[PDB]
Scaffold this motif. Structure first.
Motif, mmCIF file in Angstrom:
data_model
loop_
_atom_site.group_PDB
_atom_site.id
_atom_site.type_symbol
_atom_site.label_atom_id
_atom_site.label_comp_id
_atom_site.label_asym_id
_atom_site.label_seq_id
_atom_site.Cartn_x
_atom_site.Cartn_y
_atom_site.Cartn_z
ATOM 1 N N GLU A 38 -1.557 -1.997 -8.171
ATOM 2 C CA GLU A 38 -0.342 -1.641 -7.439
ATOM 3 C C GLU A 38 0.452 -0.574 -8.171
ATOM 4 O O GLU A 38 1.051 0.303 -7.535
ATOM 5 C CB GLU A 38 0.515 -2.883 -7.190
ATOM 6 C CG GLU A 38 -0.170 -3.876 -6.259
ATOM 7 C CD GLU A 38 0.641 -5.133 -6.029
ATOM 8 O OE1 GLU A 38 1.851 -5.139 -6.368
ATOM 9 O OE2 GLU A 38 0.055 -6.114 -5.515
ATOM 10 N N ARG A 39 0.454 -0.609 -9.507
ATOM 11 C CA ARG A 39 1.152 0.445 -10.235
ATOM 12 C C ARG A 39 0.425 1.780 -10.106
ATOM 13 O O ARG A 39 1.081 2.822 -10.015
ATOM 14 C CB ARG A 39 1.363 0.061 -11.704
ATOM 15 C CG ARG A 39 0.160 0.152 -12.610
ATOM 16 C CD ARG A 39 0.534 -0.165 -14.049
ATOM 17 N NE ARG A 39 -0.659 -0.251 -14.899
ATOM 18 C CZ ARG A 39 -0.652 -0.565 -16.194
ATOM 19 N NH1 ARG A 39 0.487 -0.840 -16.827
ATOM 20 N NH2 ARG A 39 -1.799 -0.604 -16.860
ATOM 21 N N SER A 40 -0.909 1.772 -10.031
ATOM 22 C CA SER A 40 -1.626 3.018 -9.763
ATOM 23 C C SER A 40 -1.346 3.540 -8.359
ATOM 24 O O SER A 40 -1.182 4.750 -8.165
ATOM 25 C CB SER A 40 -3.124 2.831 -9.968
ATOM 26 O OG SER A 40 -3.413 2.866 -11.346
ATOM 27 N N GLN A 41 -1.304 2.652 -7.363
ATOM 28 C CA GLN A 41 -1.001 3.102 -6.009
ATOM 29 C C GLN A 41 0.373 3.752 -5.955
ATOM 30 O O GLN A 41 0.563 4.766 -5.278
ATOM 31 C CB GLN A 41 -1.087 1.925 -5.039
ATOM 32 C CG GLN A 41 -2.475 1.312 -4.925
ATOM 33 C CD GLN A 41 -2.472 0.048 -4.073
ATOM 34 O OE1 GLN A 41 -1.430 -0.581 -3.899
ATOM 35 N NE2 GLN A 41 -3.635 -0.321 -3.529
ATOM 36 N N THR A 42 1.344 3.188 -6.677
ATOM 37 C CA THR A 42 2.669 3.795 -6.747
ATOM 38 C C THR A 42 2.611 5.187 -7.380
ATOM 39 O O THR A 42 3.247 6.130 -6.887
ATOM 40 C CB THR A 42 3.605 2.878 -7.533
ATOM 41 O OG1 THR A 42 3.615 1.577 -6.925
ATOM 42 C CG2 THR A 42 5.031 3.452 -7.574
ATOM 43 N N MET A 43 1.828 5.336 -8.464
ATOM 44 C CA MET A 43 1.684 6.628 -9.140
ATOM 45 C C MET A 43 1.218 7.721 -8.188
ATOM 46 O O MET A 43 1.649 8.874 -8.301
ATOM 47 C CB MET A 43 0.692 6.518 -10.296
ATOM 48 C CG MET A 43 1.139 5.678 -11.457
ATOM 49 S SD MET A 43 2.586 6.264 -12.307
ATOM 50 C CE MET A 43 1.917 7.594 -13.268
ATOM 51 N N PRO B 91 -9.295 9.452 -1.287
ATOM 52 C CA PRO B 91 -9.686 8.590 -0.160
ATOM 53 C C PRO B 91 -9.119 7.183 -0.278
ATOM 54 O O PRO B 91 -8.896 6.666 -1.377
ATOM 55 C CB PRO B 91 -11.215 8.564 -0.243
ATOM 56 C CG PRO B 91 -11.593 9.662 -1.180
ATOM 57 C CD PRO B 91 -10.447 9.829 -2.122
ATOM 58 N N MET B 92 -8.899 6.557 0.884
ATOM 59 C CA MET B 92 -8.291 5.228 0.911
ATOM 60 C C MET B 92 -9.194 4.196 0.275
ATOM 61 O O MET B 92 -8.697 3.232 -0.326
ATOM 62 C CB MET B 92 -7.972 4.810 2.345
ATOM 63 C CG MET B 92 -6.700 5.426 2.912
ATOM 64 S SD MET B 92 -5.193 4.829 2.094
ATOM 65 C CE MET B 92 -5.591 3.068 2.010
ATOM 66 N N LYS B 93 -10.514 4.369 0.440
ATOM 67 C CA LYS B 93 -11.493 3.556 -0.274
ATOM 68 C C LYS B 93 -11.164 3.481 -1.757
ATOM 69 O O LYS B 93 -11.219 2.402 -2.354
ATOM 70 C CB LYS B 93 -12.899 4.128 -0.061
ATOM 71 N N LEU B 94 -10.805 4.623 -2.368
ATOM 72 C CA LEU B 94 -10.383 4.632 -3.769
ATOM 73 C C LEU B 94 -8.996 4.031 -3.955
ATOM 74 O O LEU B 94 -8.723 3.438 -5.003
ATOM 75 C CB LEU B 94 -10.404 6.055 -4.323
ATOM 76 C CG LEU B 94 -11.798 6.656 -4.502
ATOM 77 C CD1 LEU B 94 -11.742 7.914 -5.353
ATOM 78 C CD2 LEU B 94 -12.695 5.622 -5.132
ATOM 79 N N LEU C 93 -0.413 1.455 5.463
ATOM 80 C CA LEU C 93 -1.718 1.852 4.931
ATOM 81 C C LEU C 93 -2.675 0.681 4.764
ATOM 82 O O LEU C 93 -3.893 0.896 4.737
ATOM 83 C CB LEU C 93 -1.566 2.559 3.587
ATOM 84 C CG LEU C 93 -0.906 3.930 3.676
ATOM 85 C CD1 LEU C 93 -0.904 4.567 2.307
ATOM 86 C CD2 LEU C 93 -1.618 4.805 4.688
ATOM 87 N N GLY C 94 -2.153 -0.536 4.640
ATOM 88 C CA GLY C 94 -2.976 -1.723 4.623
ATOM 89 C C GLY C 94 -3.311 -2.191 3.228
ATOM 90 O O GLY C 94 -4.441 -2.605 2.966
ATOM 91 N N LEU C 95 -2.345 -2.145 2.320
ATOM 92 C CA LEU C 95 -2.597 -2.495 0.930
ATOM 93 C C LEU C 95 -1.868 -3.765 0.512
ATOM 94 O O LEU C 95 -1.843 -4.083 -0.685
ATOM 95 C CB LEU C 95 -2.220 -1.311 0.028
ATOM 96 C CG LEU C 95 -2.903 0.003 0.446
ATOM 97 C CD1 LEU C 95 -2.147 1.211 -0.052
ATOM 98 C CD2 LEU C 95 -4.371 0.060 -0.021
#
Ligand SMILES: C=C1[C@@]2(C)C[C@H]3[C@]4(C)CCC(=O)OC(C)(C)[C@H]4CC[C@]3(C)[C@]1(C(=O)OC)C(=O)[C@@](C)(O)C2=O
Ligand SMILES: O=C(O)CCC(=O)C(=O)O
Ligand SMILES: O=C(O)CCC(=O)C(=O)O
Ligand SMILES: [Fe+3]
Ligand SMILES: [Fe+3]
Lengths: 285, 294
Positions: free
Chosen positions: B258-263, B249-252, B291-293
């Motif tokens: 940022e490195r986790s989002q890339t993963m 989920p986007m909440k998570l 996505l709004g990050l």
């Protein structure tokens, strides 16, 4: 009597409109094939005007720096912008028929999915695009040479006319059977300056080019030479576009099961903990 | 040690506080290496508790044959705060991933293939010997000259013993001159391949190249459910086994670094070929915009 007798004959580029195993055999033997009228004529125009406002909002870089953005317009959101593209173009039953012959193994279902949906507009007066193989996007693929499997194929379709003057793509048929696949540079390619191309077409014509084939766009005053690229990769490769994150769920609900797989709304690669990702997305009845 | 007894292959062992260069050299010579204390015993134990409900709802498939009696769970980010807030933020994991995957001037060269809890049940049959890059079927044909497809940080969540099915590894098999499937048809060493167990305490891990031959061992115990955490990491041009950006989920996702989002594919990375191109991007921009990050 194809060339005047005694001439050097230039690399062969067959043309079809038509049996599928037929066009495939031309693809295998030469690496490139023109498919005259891959999309219907009103469809190409219905699509072209459909995206023309998107294209109109793209500024042109006059860079002279040698890259592929130098006076060339590129736009990937063809599914949002064009109902013709997503409801008609992406649904050519022969496209899948060729994709299934390049990529799928029997009993493993669809072996392919979309890499990109790009509209490429060579602005008038653009430097020629560096010679390249499309599979350079996946940088190790060349190292496998011509015995390696297929990486990527592009159904590269003309939007406005492709002439030898506006900048049509120059193909090198047979560059998929050369013994060493290199970067096409004077340092890296022993054949630099001596590589014989063929320029590629009227609106609606595609050409299915192997990812192993060397090619590039060439260098008029008013001609916006526009094309539609349907790059397709094997299922184990990652797409250049995050389509399942930008294409809204509404449009994905309107797609066929196979088109959902093309954009990654359906799957085991790209799964959901042992299940199809399409379950969690509300797409399986 | 042993008495003229035959000495089996060494698996190098380091603590999680060794230098990444020390561990990478070991990885480089042998294709695998144990990182002791990769995860703290208190992190491991919280993770194991946090996913345990999901593990209890997974039935044990017993069949009349085929790698059964092994529970497999991949929704670790959803189920485990410890996993998403701490485990995937190991700086040692990312240091080593950069050393394998990241190219100069291109940012992160890698992302997640999978996050899988793998619980080998009592009596489970041993797994076929294999390389993990067999998942990308053309990779073996480039041989050991080829680049890396995939690496795994394979973590002991509960003890790994020779009896309960610790992985059997073949150090140096990432250097054999020909990479075939391990069967009688194609593998000439078939039935003659000497393996070595990965004996580990909870929170230990071994890092293993996709070029290394290995297989889960036979769980010859009556009671021991041997729990692992596989952090499988692939280069950015390869497709993941899990559609994480579509189930997480986007909440998570907004809580991820940022490195986790890339993963997990909530964010793109930049590839250079004279040309720059976002991989897994959105019409010229990072997908993290739409996505709004930020
Ligand atoms: C950066 C680029 C790459 C690396 C990828 C490439 C690619 C996805 C690769 C071939 C393929 O399968 O599909 C198409 C036809 C859609 C192209 C579209 C254009 C781009 C995005 C690219 C670019 O635009 O440069 C800023 C290039 O022009 C080019 C040729 O240099 C590249 O190889
Ligand atoms: O623009 C063209 O004609 C060729 C497209 C191409 O080669 C590319 O960008 O990959
Ligand atoms: O569980 C194990 O010990 C090995 C699992 C493994 O090697 C795999 O799934 O590829
Ligand atoms: Fe190209
Ligand atoms: Fe494995």
């Amino acid at each position: 009597g194809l060339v005047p007798r005694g001439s050097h004959m230039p690399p062969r580029l067959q043309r079809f409109p038509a049996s599928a195993d037929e066009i495939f055999a031309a693809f295998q033997e030469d690496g490139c094939v023109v498919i005259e009228g891959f999309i219907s004529p009103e469809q190409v125009a219905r699509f072209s005007q459909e995206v023309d406002p998107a294209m109109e909002k793209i500024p042109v870089e006059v860079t002279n720096n040698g890259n592929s953005n130098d006076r060339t317009k590129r736009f990937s959101k063809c599914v949002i912008a064009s109902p013709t593209f997503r409801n008609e173009i992406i649904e050519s039953d022969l496209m899948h028929e060729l994709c299934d012959r390049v990529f799928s193994k029997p009993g493993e279902g669809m072996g392919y999915h979309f890499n990109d949906n790009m509209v490429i507009e060579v602005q008038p007066g653009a430097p020629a695009q560096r010679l390249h193989r499309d599979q350079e996007l996946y940088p190790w693929w060349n190292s496998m040479g011509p015995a390696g499997p297929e990486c990527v194929i592009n159904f590269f379709c003309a939007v406005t006319p492709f002439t030898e003057e506006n900048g049509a793509t120059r193909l090198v048929p047979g560059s998929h059977l050369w013994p060493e696949f290199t970067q096409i540079n004077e340092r890296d390619c022993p054949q630099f300056g001596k590589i014989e191309t063929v320029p590629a077409m009227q609106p609606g014509d595609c050409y299915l080019m192997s990812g192993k084939v060397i090619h590039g766009a060439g260098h008029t005053t008013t001609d916006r030479r526009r094309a539609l690229a349907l790059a397709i990769i094997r299922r184990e490769l990652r797409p250049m576009q995050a389509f399942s994150l930008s294409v809204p769920m509404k449009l994905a609900r309107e797609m066929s099961e196979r088109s959902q797989t093309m954009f990654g709304f359906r799957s085991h690669f790209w799964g959901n903990d042992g299940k199809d990702i399409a379950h969690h997305l509300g797409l399986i009845s």
